[PDB]
Amino acid sequence: QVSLGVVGIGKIARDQHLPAIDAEPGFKLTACASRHAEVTGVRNYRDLRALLAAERELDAVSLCAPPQVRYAQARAALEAGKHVMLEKPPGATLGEVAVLEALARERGLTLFATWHSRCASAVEPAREWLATRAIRAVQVRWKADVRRWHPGQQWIWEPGGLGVFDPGINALSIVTRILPRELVLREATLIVPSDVQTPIAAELDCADTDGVPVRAEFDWRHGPVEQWEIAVDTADGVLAISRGGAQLSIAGEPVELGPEREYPALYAHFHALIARGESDVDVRPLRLVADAFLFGRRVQTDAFGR
Amino acid sequence: QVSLGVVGIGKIARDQHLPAIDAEPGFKLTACASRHAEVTGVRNYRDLRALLAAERELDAVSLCAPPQVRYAQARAALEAGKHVMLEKPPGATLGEVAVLEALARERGLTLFATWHSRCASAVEPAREWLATRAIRAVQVRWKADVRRQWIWEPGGLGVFDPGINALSIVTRILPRELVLREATLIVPSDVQTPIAAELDCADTDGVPVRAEFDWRHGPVEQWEIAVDTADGVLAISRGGAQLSIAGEPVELGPEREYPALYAHFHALIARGESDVDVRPLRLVADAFLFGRRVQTDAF
Ligand SMILES: NC(=O)c1ccc[n+]([C@@H]2O[C@H](COP(=O)([O-])OP(=O)(O)OC[C@H]3O[C@@H](n4cnc5c(N)ncnc54)[C@H](OP(=O)(O)O)[C@@H]3O)[C@@H](O)[C@H]2O)c1
């Protein structure tokens, strides 16, 4: 078993990481680090620094804290000789992820930038069906109530928190996986409430290298049922991904999919990467978001109320 | 020699590119493309597609148009089997540059993303002196008066349009990669790009690298990079033309940024290599992504 530590025991750590780790036989949950939480049955620390100082035989760390502290924690873990798994986004900047990848490669360690939505069951079936066909247009709708997915959370509204791109980048992680050709941003509009620093809604107009238009609408102002949809119009009809990747229809016919197991799949991949002595750092979804911030118009809207 | 075409004959093509090409023996200027300008002594076209269709023996092209039109030109040139040299910045977005580098690598073609300020006289001496030494801190001060439209449009970079030149020097002289830790963009309420900006970086050894860019009226114009080491301060001034080390001024040669660029482009084509350093643009992108934004009075 690979000995594993988890950093930042918050919403996604309780909802997804700890259950997936517990059911993954390749890992032994050995330690956890959190300022305001502890995990029963394992050794607990207030911060990653104290965990690394004490857990010299630990093999790997998985980071579930906000992305603004991701670089500092991942660098420390890599410098201590641990393989590192990163929640999405892999960093607040592209430069820090490049530095981490070079460092992990400069230490022979596994670095894994995870995109949990890429492990949704519809993703690889969609990629396989689309690799052969003539794509005409792509439509993305990724809208959910922020208060239901990040209740009480403030880092989403601070610089490096991405705002609506925090879930929106999941859609881009799927699109960049299922489309055969690279995307380039052509225009973007970011809608930023008067009281925050990140967008609550955004529109993206991209094209792949063949000129296929990729239109995306992200919104955190929404009712209680998510709209997490990607529609690829082809010459053979429409491929429609819905429910964040849990549902797939091709030319109007539903497609049978296995059960959702995104985070089990992530941890299985992390273990396999370590046993292979390989890394997996795809920053293309974050690079497109960076282009959106660099090139995109910014429009003020009314206060969110944080 | 290498047959060469130039696209976008503006003032910098007239002042810098064409004289440098004329004096570079490795190239023969064969054709130029420009919508509103013709170049004496060579064949002339109004767009790159026409040039490419006609100049079938052409080996390479140098693109001097702004980045908003350069990506489509660079694609067509690489697809036509030509080596490509790009003015700075190499793209309007990082995705554009990634596409070109993949395209060039797949056809075995030379792609050269130039940073003309990296060829200023002080840059390579500063890099040699700093390579071995214990650096403590770096400070960049870029200030000027903007009063002396694309710059205020979404994607126009704002103060980073010239400020990225200082970032290309910083990233060349320092021996380790920079990570942006905090940024602040000051945006006039009637524009979409920053008039002033502060960057807070740290290199991979933790060395703080601070940069301030200001386009507003204030104190006297300045362009300075100061790198404090255990052996004293290294100071670059005058956009890279002037160098001081531990208080001692250093003798530098005349400015030949664009002759240097074209000599390197020729050398890249000879060795079959590319040179696509996107890090100065990536740092600017990180500032737009990670930066805190502050509104100021209309411009
Ligand atoms: N919310 C979701 O549904 C979801 C789903 C998939 C992926 N994710 C990703 O997972 C990451 C965290 O998401 P989340 O919803 O779990 O947010 P979160 O609960 O608010 O943050 C997780 C924990 O990180 C710690 N934290 C906050 N600031 C910190 C700081 N400076 N330094 C160290 N620890 C700090 C906190 O634990 P302590 O106070 O105890 O130290 C926090 O409880 C994000 O990158 C997010 O994008 C979220």
Residues A108, A163, single domain; the answer is: no
Minimal-distance CA residue of chain A relative to B75? A209
Out of B71, B154, B179, whose CB is closest to A99? Answer: B179
Rounded distance between C-alpha atoms, residue A21 and residue A31, angstroms? 12
- Give the count of domains, chain A: 2
Residue A202 is inside which H or E element, if any? strand A201-208
Residue whose CA is at the smallest distance from ligand 1 atom 32: A69
Rounded distance between C-alpha atoms, residue B187 and residue B197, angstroms? 9
Residues B263, B197, single domain; the answer is: yes
Residues B109, B127, single domain; the answer is: no
Residue A99 is inside which H or E element, if any? helix A94-105
Residues A84, A138, single domain; the answer is: no
- Counted residue by residue, chain A has a size of 306
Residue B98 is inside which H or E element, if any? helix B94-106
Q: Which of B92, B114, B136 is the last residue of a domain?
A: B114
Torsion-angle region of residue A25: left (phi > 0), alpha (psi -120 to 50) or beta?
alpha
Q: Which residues of A are catalytic?
A: 88
Give resolution, Å, one decimal.
Answer: 2.1
Rounded distance between C-alpha atoms, residue A52 and residue A265, angstroms? 26
Pocket test for ligand 1, best of A16, A35, A157 (most atoms within 8 A of CB): A35
Identify any residues that bridge with B234 across adjacent strands, giving them in sequence order: B227, B245
Cis peptide before A199 (omega within 30 of 0): no
Contact B180 A96 (CB under 8 A): yes
Residues A296, A164, single domain; the answer is: yes
- Laid out side by side, the sheet with A253-255 consists of A253-255, A247-250, A237-242, A227-234, A135-143, A213-219, A201-208, A183-193, A297-301
Contact B94 A94 (CB under 8 A): yes
Rounded distance between C-alpha atoms, residue B76 and residue B48, angstroms? 8
Q: Which residues of B are annotated as a binding site for NADP(+)?
A: 12, 34-35, 161
Contact A95 B289 (CB under 8 A): no
Count CB neighbours of B248 within 10 A. Answer: 8
**Token pair belonging to B137:** 């801190």
Residues A108, A120, single domain; the answer is: no
Contact B44, B34 (CB under 8 A): yes
Q: Which of A67, A86, A114 is the last residue of a domain?
A: A114
**Token pair belonging to B69:** 């039109």
Identify any residues that bridge with A281 across adjacent strands, giving them in sequence order: none
Rounded distance between C-alpha atoms, residue A91 and residue A113, angstroms? 9
> B-chain residues within 8 Å CB-CB of A291?
93-95, 285
B→A interface, C-beta within 8 Å: 71, 92-96, 98-99, 102, 154-155, 177-180, 182-183, 192, 204, 279, 282-286, 288-293
Rounded distance between C-alpha atoms, residue A165 and residue A146, angstroms? 11
Q: Which domain holds residue B273?
A: 115-299
CA-based nearest distance B284→chain A, Å: 8
CA dihedral over A254, A256, A262, A267, signed as positive or negative: negative
Residues A160, A272, single domain; the answer is: yes
Rounded distance between C-alpha atoms, residue B50 and residue B275, angstroms? 27
Query: What is the DSSP annotation of B220-274?
Result: --EEEEEEEETTEEEEEEGGGTEEEETTEE-------HHHHHHHHHHHHHHHT--
- CA B214 from centroid of its chain's CA atoms: 19
- CA A287 from centroid of its chain's CA atoms: 13
Minimal-distance CA residue of chain A relative to B92? A295
Angle between helices A284-295 and A94-105 (to 10 degrees): 150
- b/e string for B162-186 if b means 16 or more Cβ within 10 A? bbbbbbbbbbbbbeebbbbbbbbbb
Rounded distance between C-alpha atoms, residue A204 and residue A215, angstroms? 6
